[PDB]
Amino acid sequence: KWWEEERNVFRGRADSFIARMHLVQGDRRFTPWKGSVVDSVVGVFLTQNVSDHLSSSAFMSLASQFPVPFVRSTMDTVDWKAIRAADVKEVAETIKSRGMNHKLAERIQGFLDRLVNDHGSIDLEWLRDVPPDKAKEYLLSFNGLGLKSVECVRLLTLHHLAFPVDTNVGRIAVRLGWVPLQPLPESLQLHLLEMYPMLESIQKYLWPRLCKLDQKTLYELHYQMITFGKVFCTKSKPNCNACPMKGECRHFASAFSQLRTEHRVYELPDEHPLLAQLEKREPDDPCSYLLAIWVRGTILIPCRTAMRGSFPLNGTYFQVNEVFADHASSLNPINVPIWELPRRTVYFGTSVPTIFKGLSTEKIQACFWKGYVCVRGFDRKTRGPKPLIARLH
DNA sequence: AGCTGAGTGATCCGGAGTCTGAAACA
DNA sequence: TTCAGACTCGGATCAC
Ligand code: SF4
């Protein structure tokens, strides 16, 4: 029964959280994405020890290097048989921009070899049928996957009852009024808030509190937690004064220009005849097409439209207001000889934390309601990632 | 008692960032 | 003013 009270109090903290920020991050509602499960497995391979934008870029580089011949559609966008028949050198060169490329490429090749010598064709849709316990056991039975990876794959793709704790989640849960930094032990004397490394097996002390909650609740909690950690709780100087839990974050009680490059531009309606070469935008994005201005023009495209959805891990790599830069439209921008359209801001930069540092709360709210973020570029022809043009940031 | 052994504890893999201290000059 | 080396988004070992 005492277990019950703890569970209830945690449920309450979560509810206060998922709501309080819901007035800031807009609508983080569940939206399904296409794609097989092997896409998720390769993605969780790829994002093991690298930042999110770099991992997404490496994944799309893999996708464009070997695209599936093509005309929740659980069909892999990458012809993994080609990678099975490929060589280690070239595939490591494919993700050379990520690091660890030899090691990761070898691990991917070993995983694919294990799969094919197990049951022939490359397929894991049947993981959706077995009980979650045995599926979790078999996924963990692989090499190169710890517990965080399998928990993440299960929760965000197979919709089980799981909670992956990345660095942000552990830091957040140890720094707020939630579980302290002394779960099993008793420090009781530190006299500072240095946040020395406590990203570890704490889950045995946290998972019991999160045994019985809704799946959508856990999905939204994870999504909003990671974006909130990206924007508000950074390892170096959080904008703690501006966090709505300033009256509740335990760390805040201890004490009490070149980053952003924005251009006020106009968005593109979905029925503009000059956009006929732009993949025929799909209807499941709150945000729309954008155009960057300096007779002159340069277009912007949303991420989900650019990739046709079907991104691994249900597309949690990307922010809600995240757009791509068309490489062709950047190399030789189009001359379009348009003022009465609504004016919107682009907030260019290089990552999520870099752009949002130093900003006041109202500016954050504005850029989440009628704002946008872009940190990279994209080529329509080869469907591959490319470095961002230096003409803006 | 004299050999486990459990568990961590460093350390690794590796590009691209940024951040930060020294130097330098006043 | 430079700039250069340190540090920052897990899973294998391997030593203790
Ligand atoms: S109150 Fe400040 S330090 Fe605490 S989580 Fe919010 S932004 Fe971070």
Side-chain angles (χ1 to χ4, degrees):
Chain A
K1 0 119 248 113
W2 82 110
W3 218 239
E4 271 50 67
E5 213 274 328
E6 297 299 315
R7 287 235 251 261
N8 294 329
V9 99
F10 273 71
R11 276 229 28 204
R13 301 300 297 279
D15 295 324
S16 99
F17 186 41
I18 63 171
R20 192 169 179 86
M21 311 275 137
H22 193 290
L23 309 184
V24 184
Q25 293 84 18
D27 186 25
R28 301 304 164 109
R29 178 183 50 66
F30 193 109
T31 312
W33 291 55
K34 297 189 289 183
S36 70
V37 180
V38 184
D39 293 332
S40 174
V41 186
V42 176
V44 72
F45 292 166
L46 196 151
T47 184
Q48 271 284 15
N49 209 345
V50 65
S51 163
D52 291 331
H53 61 279
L54 294 174
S55 65
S56 66
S57 179
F59 183 79
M60 301 166 318
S61 178
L62 285 174
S64 183
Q65 187 95 44
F66 311 101
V68 75
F70 67 98
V71 237
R72 286 205 273 259
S73 180
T74 72
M75 321 285 158
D76 45 343
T77 57
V78 183
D79 59 357
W80 310 98
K81 181 257 184 182
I83 297 89
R84 184 290 301 151
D87 204 304
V88 192
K89 298 183 290 294
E90 190 276 332
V91 65
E93 198 87 26
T94 313
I95 59 167
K96 67 184 289 184
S97 45
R98 192 261 188 216
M100 322 275 268
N101 64 7
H102 323 92
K103 179 170 167 192
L104 282 180
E106 292 176 354
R107 281 201 195 261
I108 295 191
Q109 284 224 30
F111 156 78
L112 292 178
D113 193 0
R114 173 147 168 183
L115 192 70
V116 298
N117 65 57
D118 177 273
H119 67 317
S121 167
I122 297 168
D123 70 314
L124 294 174
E125 72 295 340
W126 50 270
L127 276 164
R128 302 198 161 279
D129 308 342
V130 298
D133 266 328
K134 188 66 177 176
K136 174 193 91 93
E137 190 277 331
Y138 208 58
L139 263 190
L140 203 172
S141 68
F142 279 84
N143 73 318
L145 281 64
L147 184 44
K148 202 215 80 151
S149 66
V150 296
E151 296 291 329
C152 185
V153 163
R154 271 196 317 152
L155 162 77
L156 279 157
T157 315
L158 301 173
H159 323 281
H160 302 162
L161 277 297
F163 196 42
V165 294
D166 316 339
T167 74
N168 274 297
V169 175
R171 206 179 48 232
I172 285 175
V174 70
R175 210 174 302 194
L176 280 72
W178 312 357
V179 292
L181 58 85
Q182 43 190 359
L184 304 326
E186 291 295 295
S187 44
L188 271 297
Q189 59 155 358
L190 293 173
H191 312 149
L192 78 165
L193 276 297
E194 75 174 359
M195 182 65 228
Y196 86 108
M198 294 297 103
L199 293 174
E200 65 183 1
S201 64
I202 62 170
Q203 295 298 109
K204 276 307 293 174
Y205 182 76
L206 179 136
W207 187 246
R209 318 296 195 274
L210 283 72
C211 295
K212 299 264 159 42
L213 283 72
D214 186 74
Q215 183 266 2
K216 296 297 203 65
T217 299
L218 288 176
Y219 182 100
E220 201 206 350
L221 180 70
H222 164 89
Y223 204 113
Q224 183 213 79
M225 191 95 58
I226 63 169
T227 187
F228 166 83
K230 290 299 204 305
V231 176
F232 271 41
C233 254
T234 300
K235 193 175 293 185
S236 72
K237 272 297 306 192
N239 285 99
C240 190
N241 69 303
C243 175
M245 283 74 74
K246 66 184 289 184
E248 302 86 339
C249 172
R250 296 282 79 79
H251 173 281
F252 189 59
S254 160
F256 180 65
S257 300
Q258 199 154 104
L259 292 202
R260 83 285 184 274
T261 310
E262 82 170 48
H263 317 72
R264 194 41 180 251
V265 300
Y266 310 139
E267 68 94 18
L268 294 174
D270 307 63
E271 199 64 14
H272 176 47
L274 271 296
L275 281 193
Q277 309 293 112
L278 277 297
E279 287 289 324
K280 185 43 211 173
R281 184 181 150 51
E282 61 86 20
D284 285 342
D285 291 331
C287 285
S288 314
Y289 264 61
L290 281 63
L291 198 151
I293 74 168
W294 287 91
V295 184
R296 182 75 276 171
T298 300
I299 68 172
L300 280 192
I301 62 170
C303 65
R304 190 187 186 121
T305 75
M307 303 166 320
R308 314 150 182 168
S310 198
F311 210 76
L313 265 291
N314 190 258
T316 66
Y317 291 76
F318 292 164
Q319 271 315 309
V320 165
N321 47 341
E322 185 94 17
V323 305
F324 276 176
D326 175 44
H327 182 74
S329 162
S330 51
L331 259 183
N332 282 7
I334 188 168
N335 306 116
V336 296
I338 53 162
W339 43 266
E340 191 175 1
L341 305 175
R343 60 162 50 72
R344 293 293 147 247
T345 302
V346 288
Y347 282 84
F348 276 99
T350 182
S351 81
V352 176
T354 48
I355 305 192
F356 292 143
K357 273 304 302 204
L359 309 189
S360 46
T361 312
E362 290 85 315
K363 302 184 78 69
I364 308 165
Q365 203 213 37
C367 62
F368 283 122
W369 300 122
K370 283 144 281 292
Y372 295 92
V373 180
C374 177
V375 306
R376 64 161 91 71
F378 171 71
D379 164 87
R380 290 176 296 92
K381 201 176 98 177
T382 61
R383 296 280 271 122
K386 277 308 184 55
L388 183 63
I389 191 66
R391 284 298 155 84
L392 294 174
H393 182 74

PDB file of all heavy atoms in Angstrom, chain A residues 48-49 100 144-145 167 235, chain C residues 7-13:
ATOM      1  N   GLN A  48      23.947   5.849 -30.805  1.00  0.00           N
ATOM      2  CA  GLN A  48      24.339   5.302 -29.512  1.00  0.00           C
ATOM      3  C   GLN A  48      25.135   6.309 -28.688  1.00  0.00           C
ATOM      4  O   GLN A  48      24.852   6.510 -27.502  1.00  0.00           O
ATOM      5  CB  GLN A  48      25.129   4.009 -29.703  1.00  0.00           C
ATOM      6  CG  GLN A  48      24.254   2.762 -29.759  1.00  0.00           C
ATOM      7  CD  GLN A  48      23.735   2.323 -28.405  1.00  0.00           C
ATOM      8  OE1 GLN A  48      23.782   3.070 -27.431  1.00  0.00           O
ATOM      9  NE2 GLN A  48      23.223   1.100 -28.341  1.00  0.00           N
ATOM     10  N   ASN A  49      26.136   6.949 -29.287  1.00  0.00           N
ATOM     11  CA  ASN A  49      26.992   7.874 -28.544  1.00  0.00           C
ATOM     12  C   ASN A  49      27.311   9.115 -29.373  1.00  0.00           C
ATOM     13  O   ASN A  49      28.451   9.576 -29.430  1.00  0.00           O
ATOM     14  CB  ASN A  49      28.271   7.179 -28.088  1.00  0.00           C
ATOM     15  CG  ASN A  49      28.829   7.769 -26.809  1.00  0.00           C
ATOM     16  OD1 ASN A  49      28.434   8.857 -26.392  1.00  0.00           O
ATOM     17  ND2 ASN A  49      29.751   7.052 -26.180  1.00  0.00           N
ATOM     18  N   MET A 100      33.219   6.768 -35.063  1.00  0.00           N
ATOM     19  CA  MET A 100      33.097   5.350 -34.739  1.00  0.00           C
ATOM     20  C   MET A 100      32.725   4.505 -35.948  1.00  0.00           C
ATOM     21  O   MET A 100      32.231   3.384 -35.782  1.00  0.00           O
ATOM     22  CB  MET A 100      32.063   5.119 -33.631  1.00  0.00           C
ATOM     23  CG  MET A 100      32.061   6.166 -32.534  1.00  0.00           C
ATOM     24  SD  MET A 100      33.260   5.871 -31.233  1.00  0.00           S
ATOM     25  CE  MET A 100      32.262   4.943 -30.074  1.00  0.00           C
ATOM     26  N   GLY A 144      26.188  -5.159 -28.572  1.00  0.00           N
ATOM     27  CA  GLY A 144      26.110  -3.766 -28.942  1.00  0.00           C
ATOM     28  C   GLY A 144      24.872  -3.049 -28.455  1.00  0.00           C
ATOM     29  O   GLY A 144      24.724  -1.852 -28.729  1.00  0.00           O
ATOM     30  N   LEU A 145      23.967  -3.741 -27.763  1.00  0.00           N
ATOM     31  CA  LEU A 145      22.751  -3.138 -27.225  1.00  0.00           C
ATOM     32  C   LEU A 145      22.740  -3.345 -25.717  1.00  0.00           C
ATOM     33  O   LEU A 145      22.809  -4.483 -25.242  1.00  0.00           O
ATOM     34  CB  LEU A 145      21.494  -3.734 -27.855  1.00  0.00           C
ATOM     35  CG  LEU A 145      21.080  -3.255 -29.246  1.00  0.00           C
ATOM     36  CD1 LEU A 145      22.124  -3.628 -30.266  1.00  0.00           C
ATOM     37  CD2 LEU A 145      19.722  -3.808 -29.643  1.00  0.00           C
ATOM     38  N   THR A 167      20.930  10.605 -21.226  1.00  0.00           N
ATOM     39  CA  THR A 167      21.624  11.489 -20.295  1.00  0.00           C
ATOM     40  C   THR A 167      20.694  12.571 -19.767  1.00  0.00           C
ATOM     41  O   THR A 167      20.732  12.900 -18.576  1.00  0.00           O
ATOM     42  CB  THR A 167      22.837  12.129 -20.962  1.00  0.00           C
ATOM     43  OG1 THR A 167      22.404  13.144 -21.876  1.00  0.00           O
ATOM     44  CG2 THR A 167      23.635  11.101 -21.701  1.00  0.00           C
ATOM     45  N   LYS A 235      23.604  20.993 -19.383  1.00  0.00           N
ATOM     46  CA  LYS A 235      24.658  20.672 -18.426  1.00  0.00           C
ATOM     47  C   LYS A 235      25.490  21.889 -18.046  1.00  0.00           C
ATOM     48  O   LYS A 235      26.089  21.899 -16.965  1.00  0.00           O
ATOM     49  CB  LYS A 235      25.571  19.582 -18.991  1.00  0.00           C
ATOM     50  CG  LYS A 235      26.508  18.963 -17.966  1.00  0.00           C
ATOM     51  CD  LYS A 235      27.305  17.810 -18.551  1.00  0.00           C
ATOM     52  CE  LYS A 235      26.408  16.639 -18.899  1.00  0.00           C
ATOM     53  NZ  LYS A 235      27.192  15.463 -19.364  1.00  0.00           N
TER      54      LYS A 235
ATOM     55  P    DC C   7      39.004  17.450 -19.756  1.00  0.00           P
ATOM     56  OP1  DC C   7      38.940  17.646 -18.291  1.00  0.00           O
ATOM     57  OP2  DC C   7      39.558  16.194 -20.305  1.00  0.00           O
ATOM     58  O5'  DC C   7      37.534  17.665 -20.343  1.00  0.00           O
ATOM     59  C5'  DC C   7      36.823  18.851 -20.034  1.00  0.00           C
ATOM     60  C4'  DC C   7      35.542  18.943 -20.842  1.00  0.00           C
ATOM     61  O4'  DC C   7      35.850  19.273 -22.219  1.00  0.00           O
ATOM     62  C3'  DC C   7      34.705  17.659 -20.886  1.00  0.00           C
ATOM     63  O3'  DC C   7      33.377  17.938 -20.476  1.00  0.00           O
ATOM     64  C2'  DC C   7      34.758  17.239 -22.358  1.00  0.00           C
ATOM     65  C1'  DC C   7      34.964  18.573 -23.049  1.00  0.00           C
ATOM     66  N1   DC C   7      35.565  18.455 -24.399  1.00  0.00           N
ATOM     67  C2   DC C   7      34.866  18.939 -25.508  1.00  0.00           C
ATOM     68  O2   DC C   7      33.760  19.463 -25.338  1.00  0.00           O
ATOM     69  N3   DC C   7      35.424  18.825 -26.736  1.00  0.00           N
ATOM     70  C4   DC C   7      36.620  18.254 -26.874  1.00  0.00           C
ATOM     71  N4   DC C   7      37.130  18.163 -28.105  1.00  0.00           N
ATOM     72  C5   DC C   7      37.346  17.750 -25.755  1.00  0.00           C
ATOM     73  C6   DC C   7      36.787  17.872 -24.548  1.00  0.00           C
ATOM     74  P    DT C   8      32.406  16.749 -20.000  1.00  0.00           P
ATOM     75  OP1  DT C   8      32.225  16.879 -18.538  1.00  0.00           O
ATOM     76  OP2  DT C   8      32.908  15.477 -20.566  1.00  0.00           O
ATOM     77  O5'  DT C   8      31.013  17.097 -20.701  1.00  0.00           O
ATOM     78  C5'  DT C   8      30.877  18.294 -21.455  1.00  0.00           C
ATOM     79  C4'  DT C   8      29.882  18.105 -22.585  1.00  0.00           C
ATOM     80  O4'  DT C   8      30.573  18.193 -23.859  1.00  0.00           O
ATOM     81  C3'  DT C   8      29.161  16.759 -22.585  1.00  0.00           C
ATOM     82  O3'  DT C   8      27.800  16.940 -22.942  1.00  0.00           O
ATOM     83  C2'  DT C   8      29.921  15.964 -23.644  1.00  0.00           C
ATOM     84  C1'  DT C   8      30.278  17.056 -24.636  1.00  0.00           C
ATOM     85  N1   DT C   8      31.466  16.735 -25.480  1.00  0.00           N
ATOM     86  C2   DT C   8      31.526  17.217 -26.764  1.00  0.00           C
ATOM     87  O2   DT C   8      30.652  17.904 -27.259  1.00  0.00           O
ATOM     88  N3   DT C   8      32.655  16.866 -27.457  1.00  0.00           N
ATOM     89  C4   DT C   8      33.706  16.096 -27.002  1.00  0.00           C
ATOM     90  O4   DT C   8      34.679  15.836 -27.701  1.00  0.00           O
ATOM     91  C5   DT C   8      33.579  15.620 -25.647  1.00  0.00           C
ATOM     92  C7   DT C   8      34.659  14.774 -25.042  1.00  0.00           C
ATOM     93  C6   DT C   8      32.479  15.958 -24.959  1.00  0.00           C
ATOM     94  P    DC C   9      26.706  15.773 -22.794  1.00  0.00           P
ATOM     95  OP1  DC C   9      25.527  16.260 -22.046  1.00  0.00           O
ATOM     96  OP2  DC C   9      27.452  14.576 -22.310  1.00  0.00           O
ATOM     97  O5'  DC C   9      26.059  15.467 -24.223  1.00  0.00           O
ATOM     98  C5'  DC C   9      24.875  14.615 -24.302  1.00  0.00           C
ATOM     99  C4'  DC C   9      24.127  14.766 -25.610  1.00  0.00           C
ATOM    100  O4'  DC C   9      25.068  15.085 -26.652  1.00  0.00           O
ATOM    101  C3'  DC C   9      23.411  13.500 -26.095  1.00  0.00           C
ATOM    102  O3'  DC C   9      22.180  13.696 -26.837  1.00  0.00           O
ATOM    103  C2'  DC C   9      24.482  12.793 -26.908  1.00  0.00           C
ATOM    104  C1'  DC C   9      25.420  13.908 -27.369  1.00  0.00           C
ATOM    105  N1   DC C   9      26.851  13.645 -27.139  1.00  0.00           N
ATOM    106  C2   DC C   9      27.794  14.564 -27.608  1.00  0.00           C
ATOM    107  O2   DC C   9      27.400  15.576 -28.207  1.00  0.00           O
ATOM    108  N3   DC C   9      29.109  14.328 -27.399  1.00  0.00           N
ATOM    109  C4   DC C   9      29.493  13.225 -26.751  1.00  0.00           C
ATOM    110  N4   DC C   9      30.800  13.032 -26.568  1.00  0.00           N
ATOM    111  C5   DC C   9      28.553  12.272 -26.265  1.00  0.00           C
ATOM    112  C6   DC C   9      27.255  12.516 -26.483  1.00  0.00           C
ATOM    113  P    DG C  10      23.585   8.732 -24.856  1.00  0.00           P
ATOM    114  OP1  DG C  10      23.693   9.134 -23.434  1.00  0.00           O
ATOM    115  OP2  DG C  10      24.579   9.233 -25.840  1.00  0.00           O
ATOM    116  O5'  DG C  10      23.564   7.139 -24.889  1.00  0.00           O
ATOM    117  C5'  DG C  10      24.461   6.367 -24.065  1.00  0.00           C
ATOM    118  C4'  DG C  10      24.783   5.053 -24.738  1.00  0.00           C
ATOM    119  O4'  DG C  10      26.186   5.014 -25.091  1.00  0.00           O
ATOM    120  C3'  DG C  10      24.552   3.814 -23.887  1.00  0.00           C
ATOM    121  O3'  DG C  10      24.208   2.688 -24.721  1.00  0.00           O
ATOM    122  C2'  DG C  10      25.915   3.581 -23.267  1.00  0.00           C
ATOM    123  C1'  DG C  10      26.813   3.920 -24.434  1.00  0.00           C
ATOM    124  N9   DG C  10      28.155   4.344 -24.062  1.00  0.00           N
ATOM    125  C8   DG C  10      28.558   4.883 -22.865  1.00  0.00           C
ATOM    126  N7   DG C  10      29.826   5.191 -22.844  1.00  0.00           N
ATOM    127  C5   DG C  10      30.289   4.821 -24.099  1.00  0.00           C
ATOM    128  C6   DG C  10      31.577   4.953 -24.678  1.00  0.00           C
ATOM    129  O6   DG C  10      32.616   5.373 -24.157  1.00  0.00           O
ATOM    130  N1   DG C  10      31.600   4.477 -25.984  1.00  0.00           N
ATOM    131  C2   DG C  10      30.519   3.967 -26.658  1.00  0.00           C
ATOM    132  N2   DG C  10      30.743   3.561 -27.915  1.00  0.00           N
ATOM    133  N3   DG C  10      29.307   3.868 -26.140  1.00  0.00           N
ATOM    134  C4   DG C  10      29.265   4.310 -24.866  1.00  0.00           C
ATOM    135  P    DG C  11      23.527   1.336 -24.135  1.00  0.00           P
ATOM    136  OP1  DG C  11      22.331   1.035 -24.957  1.00  0.00           O
ATOM    137  OP2  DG C  11      23.395   1.430 -22.653  1.00  0.00           O
ATOM    138  O5'  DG C  11      24.616   0.230 -24.480  1.00  0.00           O
ATOM    139  C5'  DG C  11      24.877  -0.097 -25.853  1.00  0.00           C
ATOM    140  C4'  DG C  11      26.269  -0.655 -26.024  1.00  0.00           C
ATOM    141  O4'  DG C  11      27.242   0.356 -25.713  1.00  0.00           O
ATOM    142  C3'  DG C  11      26.624  -1.821 -25.112  1.00  0.00           C
ATOM    143  O3'  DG C  11      26.223  -3.044 -25.738  1.00  0.00           O
ATOM    144  C2'  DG C  11      28.136  -1.725 -25.020  1.00  0.00           C
ATOM    145  C1'  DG C  11      28.467  -0.286 -25.404  1.00  0.00           C
ATOM    146  N9   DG C  11      29.104   0.463 -24.332  1.00  0.00           N
ATOM    147  C8   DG C  11      28.547   0.829 -23.131  1.00  0.00           C
ATOM    148  N7   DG C  11      29.370   1.494 -22.367  1.00  0.00           N
ATOM    149  C5   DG C  11      30.543   1.564 -23.106  1.00  0.00           C
ATOM    150  C6   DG C  11      31.788   2.164 -22.797  1.00  0.00           C
ATOM    151  O6   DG C  11      32.119   2.771 -21.771  1.00  0.00           O
ATOM    152  N1   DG C  11      32.703   2.003 -23.831  1.00  0.00           N
ATOM    153  C2   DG C  11      32.454   1.350 -25.012  1.00  0.00           C
ATOM    154  N2   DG C  11      33.469   1.298 -25.886  1.00  0.00           N
ATOM    155  N3   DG C  11      31.297   0.785 -25.313  1.00  0.00           N
ATOM    156  C4   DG C  11      30.393   0.932 -24.322  1.00  0.00           C
ATOM    157  P    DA C  12      26.680  -4.458 -25.142  1.00  0.00           P
ATOM    158  OP1  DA C  12      25.692  -5.474 -25.580  1.00  0.00           O
ATOM    159  OP2  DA C  12      26.961  -4.286 -23.696  1.00  0.00           O
ATOM    160  O5'  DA C  12      28.034  -4.760 -25.924  1.00  0.00           O
ATOM    161  C5'  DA C  12      29.148  -5.387 -25.264  1.00  0.00           C
ATOM    162  C4'  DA C  12      30.435  -5.050 -25.982  1.00  0.00           C
ATOM    163  O4'  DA C  12      30.647  -3.622 -25.945  1.00  0.00           O
ATOM    164  C3'  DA C  12      31.685  -5.667 -25.365  1.00  0.00           C
ATOM    165  O3'  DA C  12      31.989  -6.898 -26.027  1.00  0.00           O
ATOM    166  C2'  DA C  12      32.762  -4.642 -25.666  1.00  0.00           C
ATOM    167  C1'  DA C  12      32.008  -3.322 -25.665  1.00  0.00           C
ATOM    168  N9   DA C  12      32.054  -2.599 -24.397  1.00  0.00           N
ATOM    169  C8   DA C  12      31.062  -2.484 -23.457  1.00  0.00           C
ATOM    170  N7   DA C  12      31.397  -1.758 -22.419  1.00  0.00           N
ATOM    171  C5   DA C  12      32.701  -1.371 -22.691  1.00  0.00           C
ATOM    172  C6   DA C  12      33.621  -0.586 -21.978  1.00  0.00           C
ATOM    173  N6   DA C  12      33.355  -0.024 -20.798  1.00  0.00           N
ATOM    174  N1   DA C  12      34.839  -0.390 -22.529  1.00  0.00           N
ATOM    175  C2   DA C  12      35.102  -0.952 -23.715  1.00  0.00           C
ATOM    176  N3   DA C  12      34.319  -1.705 -24.484  1.00  0.00           N
ATOM    177  C4   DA C  12      33.118  -1.881 -23.906  1.00  0.00           C
ATOM    178  P    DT C  13      32.694  -8.086 -25.226  1.00  0.00           P
ATOM    179  OP1  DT C  13      32.518  -9.335 -26.008  1.00  0.00           O
ATOM    180  OP2  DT C  13      32.236  -8.026 -23.816  1.00  0.00           O
ATOM    181  O5'  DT C  13      34.233  -7.683 -25.260  1.00  0.00           O
ATOM    182  C5'  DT C  13      34.946  -7.438 -24.036  1.00  0.00           C
ATOM    183  C4'  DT C  13      36.098  -6.494 -24.284  1.00  0.00           C
ATOM    184  O4'  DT C  13      35.745  -5.178 -23.798  1.00  0.00           O
ATOM    185  C3'  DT C  13      37.375  -6.867 -23.542  1.00  0.00           C
ATOM    186  O3'  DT C  13      38.520  -6.362 -24.232  1.00  0.00           O
ATOM    187  C2'  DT C  13      37.214  -6.133 -22.228  1.00  0.00           C
ATOM    188  C1'  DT C  13      36.546  -4.844 -22.671  1.00  0.00           C
ATOM    189  N1   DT C  13      35.666  -4.256 -21.656  1.00  0.00           N
ATOM    190  C2   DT C  13      36.154  -3.221 -20.894  1.00  0.00           C
ATOM    191  O2   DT C  13      37.281  -2.773 -21.020  1.00  0.00           O
ATOM    192  N3   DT C  13      35.266  -2.724 -19.972  1.00  0.00           N
ATOM    193  C4   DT C  13      33.972  -3.152 -19.743  1.00  0.00           C
ATOM    194  O4   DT C  13      33.292  -2.608 -18.880  1.00  0.00           O
ATOM    195  C5   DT C  13      33.528  -4.241 -20.581  1.00  0.00           C
ATOM    196  C7   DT C  13      32.140  -4.771 -20.407  1.00  0.00           C
ATOM    197  C6   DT C  13      34.387  -4.733 -21.481  1.00  0.00           C
TER     198       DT C  13
END
